[PDB]
């Protein structure tokens, strides 16, 4: 399409590997196939202004980093001991065709949410160009 939207989730009990890209294996919505579950990366098809946001459940320290074409854009960290909390983050980015966007973790990589608390990553095109 001439639009772009996705909401993916991480469905697995094992957290990501430290200092690695966060893979979201399950899809709630992804009509253009912009987010690739095989690589864990979003790749721009339609240029323009996008909004990216995530809500990640964790029961130990977790820092989520948003990358845009190899560059770390933002980092948000949440610390917790045994109990469950939600780490959230987001940013507006004006992207060009082919640009990749993904989330990653650093040494703080926990994404083991308690039964009933999930992790989601959404993205959608707001202004075409």
């Amino acid at each position: 399409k001439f639009q772009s939207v996705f909401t993916v989730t991480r469905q697995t009990h094992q957290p990501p590997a430290p200092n690695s890209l966060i893979r979201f294996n399950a899809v709630l919505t992804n009509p253009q196939g912009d987010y690739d579950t095989s690589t864990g990366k979003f790749t721009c098809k339609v240029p323009g202004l996008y909004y990216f946001v995530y809500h990640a459940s964790h029961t130990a320290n977790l820092c989520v980093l948003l990358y845009r074409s190899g560059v770390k854009v933002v980092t948000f960290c949440g610390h917790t001991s045994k109990t469950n909390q939600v780490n959230s983050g987001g940013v507006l980015l004006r992207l060009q065709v082919g640009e990749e966007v993904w989330l990653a973790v650093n040494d703080y990589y926990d994404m083991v949410g308690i039964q009933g608390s999930d992790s989601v990553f959404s993205g959608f095109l707001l202004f075409p160009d």
Binding site: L49, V74, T75, G78, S81, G89, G90, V91, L92
Partner: protein, 132 residues
């Protein structure tokens, strides 16, 4: 065709005082330059519906007031999130119908534990949903 959006982070290393207007000095995005990077206020040029949001890293108790208004600002809501001897990232958001000349911004409170740094960001964003 009115493409309006902004995302700015706080990198200034100085504490927040009570009732002080949050200043997200570092701009990542500022389409239509309706957000003032220097300060921390968004000023409506094109009236309409907007969505405003933020994610604040913090090392303690934090409360923020979302503000709206023209020459006199008023508070829409107050977002509070506490942390006892630990680090946190909190968030707030709001859809607001804006008139030309009105400005939206975040204002600090008595709970001012807010971190603005590499590896622990604090960001403020806003975008136009539909033009009036």
């Amino acid at each position: 065709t009115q493409k309006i959006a902004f995302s700015a982070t706080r990198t200034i290393n100085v504490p927040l005082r009570r009732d002080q207007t949050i200043r997200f000095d570092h701009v990542i995005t500022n389409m239509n330059n309706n957000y003032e990077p220097r300060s921390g206020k968004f000023t409506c040029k094109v009236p309409g519906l907007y969505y405003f949001t933020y994610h604040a890293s913090s090392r303690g108790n934090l409360c923020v007031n979302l503000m709206r208004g023209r020459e006199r600002a008023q508070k829409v809501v107050t977002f509070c999130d506490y942390a006892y001897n630990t680090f946190q990232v909190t968030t707030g958001g709001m859809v607001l119908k804006l008139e030309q000349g009105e400005n939206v911004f975040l204002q600090a409170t008595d709970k001012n534990s807010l971190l603005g740094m590499e590896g622990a960001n604090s960001i403020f964003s806003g975008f136009l949903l539909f033009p009036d």
